[PDB]
Design an enzyme around this catalytic site. Structure first.
Site, mmCIF file in Angstrom:
data_model
loop_
_atom_site.group_PDB
_atom_site.id
_atom_site.type_symbol
_atom_site.label_atom_id
_atom_site.label_comp_id
_atom_site.label_asym_id
_atom_site.label_seq_id
_atom_site.Cartn_x
_atom_site.Cartn_y
_atom_site.Cartn_z
ATOM 1 N N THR C 13 0.248 -1.121 -0.060
ATOM 2 C CA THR C 13 -0.038 -0.392 -0.014
ATOM 3 C C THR C 13 0.453 1.320 0.303
ATOM 4 O O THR C 13 0.475 2.707 -0.638
ATOM 5 C CB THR C 13 -0.734 0.335 1.447
ATOM 6 O OG1 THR C 13 -1.518 -1.364 0.733
ATOM 7 C CG2 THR C 13 -1.543 0.868 1.453
ATOM 8 N N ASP C 54 2.530 -8.622 -4.688
ATOM 9 C CA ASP C 54 1.468 -9.363 -3.233
ATOM 10 C C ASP C 54 1.843 -9.378 -2.676
ATOM 11 O O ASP C 54 1.769 -10.560 -2.639
ATOM 12 C CB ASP C 54 0.034 -8.742 -4.406
ATOM 13 C CG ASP C 54 -1.084 -8.488 -3.990
ATOM 14 O OD1 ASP C 54 -2.373 -9.619 -3.971
ATOM 15 O OD2 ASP C 54 -0.947 -8.794 -2.357
ATOM 16 N N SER C 56 -0.468 -10.789 0.405
ATOM 17 C CA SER C 56 -0.317 -11.956 0.451
ATOM 18 C C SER C 56 -0.318 -12.835 -0.985
ATOM 19 O O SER C 56 -0.775 -14.573 -0.740
ATOM 20 C CB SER C 56 -2.423 -12.199 0.292
ATOM 21 O OG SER C 56 -2.948 -11.179 -0.480
ATOM 22 N N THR C 86 1.382 -4.810 4.652
ATOM 23 C CA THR C 86 1.739 -5.049 5.877
ATOM 24 C C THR C 86 1.014 -7.108 6.113
ATOM 25 O O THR C 86 1.709 -7.588 7.199
ATOM 26 C CB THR C 86 1.003 -4.432 6.447
ATOM 27 O OG1 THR C 86 -0.782 -4.381 6.114
ATOM 28 C CG2 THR C 86 1.330 -3.402 6.450
ATOM 29 N N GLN C 268 -0.579 -21.851 22.131
ATOM 30 C CA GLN C 268 -1.780 -20.392 21.308
ATOM 31 C C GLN C 268 -1.570 -19.670 22.230
ATOM 32 O O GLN C 268 -2.317 -18.672 20.862
ATOM 33 C CB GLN C 268 -3.059 -21.686 21.360
ATOM 34 C CG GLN C 268 -3.091 -22.895 20.753
ATOM 35 C CD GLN C 268 -4.575 -23.764 20.604
ATOM 36 O OE1 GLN C 268 -5.031 -22.430 20.961
ATOM 37 N NE2 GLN C 268 -4.655 -24.507 20.987
ATOM 38 N N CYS C 269 -0.968 -19.272 22.514
ATOM 39 C CA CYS C 269 -0.778 -17.738 23.995
ATOM 40 C C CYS C 269 0.132 -17.064 22.831
ATOM 41 O O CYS C 269 0.733 -17.236 22.789
ATOM 42 C CB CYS C 269 -0.685 -18.258 24.847
ATOM 43 S SG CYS C 269 -1.662 -18.918 25.430
#
Lengths: 332, 328, 328, 333
Positions: C13, C54, C56, C86, C268-269
């Site tokens: 961006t 890009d 993604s 980002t 997972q935290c």
């Protein structure tokens, strides 16, 4: 194995009964909360003061009393917790820090917004942790415990008076955080052995002028504030220590110092240090005999003049001493 | 369609040059020609550098008056005002102007910086930019103070730090938060319209006492600070507005209020309300200043004492909310 | 005394324009805002990637492209700024950290939420400070710069994305904070010189399974997720690294590792260190990823598996700290 | 007349004793002889300790049913409920139960602690004390989660930190209430909102749900593995606002899976933040392949909601539709 801590209950909401009064001997009866009596915890003896002190009505006579009480039970205990009302708790932690020479056991000032006998009282964690810290993390200083942090006494101030009242150490981090775990900060040493012997320096009330600068502040206002019996004067200035440049104001200051009045310059910003003595603010105030109070709280600054003026030192000594670090009150 | 903002550069390190920082004749104006400020989505602006520049530490109400008049004279020619100021007494000036202005119908945003605009990484860059953009695009018709990415009500704000200079608004949320997106607070309306004609009420210096209470503070030092010519007294007391019981101090406040000295009670604490009730202070004639800042109470007292008003009028109005400076 | 910084605009961006897209060569056309062309700022050469990446749709091939562009320019410049989108910024940066050996100049990855060409772009600050920090506080790591903080590349994660994108280093303080002042963290060293020749190790895509553990998760589901070609598996378990005590499931993991599948245990935290030893997962062959981020585990796995080493070597090097990506 | 709260000690560190840690039978019950819990302004309480005790990391949807069934059985005997639970999967439990309970007209607060109650300065005492107080004096008729002095929507919660300083946040919803010096309620949160039908518990059973974390280059061969039978649902953790790689082959797999009835829900791998597959933000590649948005759901609410719906005997489309509908405040849009 265990330690034994002395609780001076001098006053404050922490010990009152609701429907909201002070009540003879109730605090000692409440302390049949089993958590106070685990073997992990230290032994405590409690003394309820008589008369009980109302926090806004206190005087340096009361400081002397607290000091003396600690001096009398100094040898008999490992540590000390001073219960006390919030309004002038910072003022008391501050005065005691200087009155105690070579303090070699912890003295912790604490209390609560909510009496220990209401449900959800903040007094519970406050007293429990004060006792625990005194016992297992002794810091031989006068400290002030509140909001899950142990703050240096002469660095603390009442931040809020609200549903949520609190105290901060704006110019020094807390010595210790009472979280899920207890975290000693970096600059802290447990059980620092002092050099010489413990002694209580006395303290009598002193005529101190405190005066907030504001745009166009008149030299007549300042003049008036510096009339006998005023022996000292704290100036609250702008930013890193700027006073207005009107001649007749600076002259009122100069003349004051020449009659022997000490004039300390503290900033009026919550966090911040006065930088006198050249580039930052120029020399107007140093030329008029004003001294820097560095990043001192007004509580510290007040206590420290009370301490020095209450001795029998010359004007120049008090002056010199205001400017050395005596009990961690300031840096530089 | 397009907004034009008036920037008054009154003084302050933002317009200054690096040295070993002092002032340089009309550098802000030249400098303020970098392309971000000249951009079809920005308002137009005109700048007036004050002669002489004002030194923040040395300002007086006569300096307040010069700023107030200058806005008055340009009121009808612009959509809004940005007043560049040094940080040391910024909160006082902003508090001051909020009361002098009656029926303000256009934003007035006081701002500045701690690093001159001319230097790398200036905070003045973003302060001036957002100030302008906010004035034009999110106009709040009060006197406001913009620093650390937030717009605060002018008479609520307080310089709170003095190597990372900060302004806070301790007893009132910011009006607006200027991060990646500008977020206005819920109790805040854009371009609230004035109900009458905009006016400037004058302001002259007043001899106001600002005493701080401490344990064992003597009646004799209080007495000394109430001598003539003092006409008003701000007491900074403890907690929720508690003073020492001692008779001899109380008697001295009462004496002072009886001879027509306004005694107002504010808290020493960074946030909280004085709450007075059976009251020693009330009986002695002291009135509540609720949650006003010292800067606000001082501004309000100057405003009122500089009008041509009686003691009971000044006393009654100090306890009414005039410019959103307090609650209750 | 001026440094020269290379800016690789890979994509994102920060180099685009608005619509209801990206434009070839707009960035370099934008970079002529006078705040970049001043003697206190480094000189720069900008390179726009063709084609533009890009965020993604990135692959390890795009990592390799970036790494080689940096290799190709390594001797020419003093430090490197990678502009990037980002979405997978934290992935790229983690990847690069491992791919670079003996890095002796800084590599800062950044970009922005708003294009540089719009009102109040964060791109401006991020690009200004990236450059300035590369020049004036060179840290010879792949680092990631956003929200006024420089974080270690392989420690960072995208925590929010909506209308307030943000990155955090949840298990390591920022190396450097960029407020009004630049403040370095304590165990950070400015321009630490490297002990050997800088080289780029290559990376290729690897079939890594990620499994998020939940109550009742079936071993049959686990087994299908471990089917060939998977050569490594990252297990996201609960708290300080706890899995169900389900033996069929535990049996599935040991079969995998018996066949040469590296299986790593991450929590997972967001903030958290795995703490394992008779621990039933260690006996199943699972190893600890300590406090690694998911992006770091994955980068480190691609790095190690791309060197076609033995299973025992890859397994042993996963438990060693190669690039400051974990605290043991 | 005082309120009466039922405490279900299902498991977890709060009711244990330390050793050279261990579970110990009836100690939680012995301990709750602390006078703080027995005072006029506290509610009455009955504690049932589960037998066998549950360990949070081994939990199963069978265990969820047990907890739900226990609540149901006690639903009319009491004015509220506190479920003591180990922290590792406390968020998955609280979530599960939010969907399982239908027309809940009574507070259910899941809580626990890092430190056992018996251990000095445990967080347990404040967490149970206020859970009890909040249940009785500030009843919120939902499944909620109390930790770090804040009450959060159960299905908006997750364990964000695990260490010496373990903790829970609801990144995408402000806490419903704050337990400071003063109990402080959020706005647009009502005390005692009666529901619109009779309370009932709906069943739940294990479901072969796959969970994929995209990374750059992720090959459709690993994604093929994750879609093999028996998988009936699939959570896709994507980048930023819900963006996938858009490699055709991956589109194709996802489409092929949805076409034979596999539900495919797109959540963000970002912590705070919300998937936007409307078309402008991410395009429609993913929509066209049949994937649906989970907006700002936590993984845990997402695993929960799928287990709720896939466990009723609903059609594929009906599950699909319901996943996109707000059923218990678990998401917005």
């Amino acid at each position: 194995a265990r330690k034994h801590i002395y609780i001076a209950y001098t006053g404050g909401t922490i010990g009152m009964k609701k429907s909201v009064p002070v009540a003879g001997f109730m605090e000692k009866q409440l302390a049949s909360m089993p958590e106070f009596h685990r073997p992990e915890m230290p032994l405590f003896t409690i003394h309820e003061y008589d008369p009980l002190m109302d926090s806004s009505d206190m005087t340096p006579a009361d400081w002397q009393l607290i000091a003396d009480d600690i001096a009398a039970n100094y040898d008999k205990y490992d540590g000390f917790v001073i219960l006390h009302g919030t309004d002038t708790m910072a003022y008391t932690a501050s005065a005691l820090s200087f009155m105690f020479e070579n303090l070699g056991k912890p003295v912790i000032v604490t209390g609560s917004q909510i009496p220990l006998a209401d449900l959800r009282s903040d007094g519970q964690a406050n007293l429990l942790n004060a006792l625990h810290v005194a016992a297992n993390y002794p810091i031989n200083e006068v400290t002030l415990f509140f909001n899950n942090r142990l703050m240096r006494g002469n660095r603390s101030r009442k931040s809020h008076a609200d549903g949520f009242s609190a105290f901060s150490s704006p110019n020094l981090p807390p010595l210790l955080e009472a979280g899920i775990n207890i975290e000693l900060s970096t600059n802290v040493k447990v059980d620092e052995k002092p050099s010489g012997e413990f002694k209580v320096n006395p303290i009598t009330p002193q005529p101190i002028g405190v005066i907030t600068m504001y745009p166009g502040i008149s030299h007549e206002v300042i003049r008036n504030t510096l009339l006998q019996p005023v022996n000292a004067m704290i100036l609250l200035t702008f930013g890193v220590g700027n006073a207005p440049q009107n001649p007749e104001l600076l002259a009122q200051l100069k003349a004051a110092s020449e009659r022997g009045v000490i004039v300390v310059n503290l900033t009026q910003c919550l966090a911040g240090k006065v930088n006198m003595g050249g580039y930052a603010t120029g020399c107007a105030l140093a030329d008029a005999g004003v001294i820097s109070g560095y990043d001192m709280t007004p509580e510290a600054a007040l206590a420290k003049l009370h301490y020095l003026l209450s001795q029998n030192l010359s004007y120049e000594e008090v002056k010199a001493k205001m400017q050395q670090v005596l009990r961690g009150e300031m840096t530089l």
